[PDB]
Structure formats: structure tokens, C-alpha cells
Design a binder for this molecule. Structure first.
Ligand code: M8K
Length: 142
């Protein structure tokens, strides 16, 4: 009737210098992901994650319909990556779009290993979607 459910997402990325021929253009390997915290299963409320890569990549609309929600790639530059997390929700909101700063380690700096923790607050979710948030390890507030 009246209640808020909070769930947690973790977006992150790893990047390092690629050990390859001088004549291979891509300097870096990187990996971007969405996950839950330890012993939460976001798959209960996440229908899919869509990573929107730079237009220069082949098939830059990358869909993960189940875990792991991640893209592994090679490249030569950082970019801003739209990341859409779609919900198993019959009403609004149906999804959330993050603007992810995919930056590389440049000038012989250590590997990048970044995490961005997002808190989602669902006000007054339906019965069915409430159960999914709770199954995923969501918590109620009051
Ligand atoms: N602003 C800006 C900006 C412009 C371009 C890039 C970039 O690295 N492009 C790019 C373009 C094409 C690429 N194929 C691969 C390798 N992959 C292709 C098939 C899947 C597995 C290997 N890595 C690629 C990287 C990044 C930032």
C-alpha cells in the first residue's frame, strides 16, 4: 500500500595496457560490468543490461540478458558509456540509464579497477515487483 524498497547496484570497469604487437592499434584491454553486492542476486529484478559502446565498435549496442552483465573489449581511448539497466517491472520506472566514465590508465599508470555504487529507491512498487526486489536482497524503509 505504502512502502519504499532500496536495492544496490555496482557499476565498474577494469583497464590495463595490452601486451600485443606495435602494429596492433588497440593499446588497452577493458571490462565494464553491472553486478549486485555479495550474496545479492540482481537477476531477480534486472531483465537485462544494455551497454552503449562508442559508435566506432562493431555492434555497439551490447545486451546482457543474464549475469554476468559485462562487456570485455580492446580499445585506444576512454569514452562516456550509456548503461541501461532494464527492470522486470510492469509499471514505471521500467529502467534506469547511467552515464559511465570508461577511462583508461594512460602514460604507464597502474591498471584501473573502479567501482561506482548506486542505490535505487523504488517508491510503492507493485506486489509482484516488490517480491523481485526482496528476492534480489532489497530492503524496506519506514
Ligand atoms: N572518443 C572516442 C573513442 C573512439 C574509439 C574507441 C575505440 O577504442 N574503438 C574501437 C573500435 C573498434 C574496435 N574493435 C575492437 C576489438 N573487438 C572487436 C570485436 C569484438 C572483440 C574485439 N576494439 C575496438 C575499439 C574508443 C573511444
Amino acid at each position: 500500500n505504502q512502502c519504499t524498497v532500496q536495492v544496490r547496484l555496482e557499476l565498474g570497469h577494469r583497464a590495463q595496457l595490452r601486451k600485443k604487437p606495435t602494429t596492433e592499434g588497440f593499446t588497452h584491454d577493458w571490462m565494464v560490468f553491472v553486478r549486485g553486492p555479495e550474496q545479492c542476486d540482481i537477476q531477480h529484478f534486472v531483465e537485462k543490461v544494455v551497454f552503449w559502446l562508442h559508435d566506432s565498435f562493431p555492434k555497439p549496442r551490447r545486451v546482457c540478458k543474464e549475469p554476468p552483465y559485462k562487456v570485455e573489449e580492446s580499445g585506444y581511448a576512454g569514452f562516456i558509456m550509456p548503461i541501461e539497466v532494464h527492470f522486470k517491472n510492469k509499471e514505471e520506472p521500467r529502467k534506469v540509464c547511467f552515464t559511465y566514465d570508461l577511462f583508461l590508465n594512460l602514460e604507464g599508470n597502474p591498471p584501473v579497477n573502479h567501482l561506482r555504487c548506486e542505490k535505487l529507491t523504488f517508491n510503492n512498487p507493485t506486489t509482484e515487483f516488490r517480491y523481485k526486489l526482496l528476492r534480489a536482497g532489497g530492503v524496506m524503509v519506514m
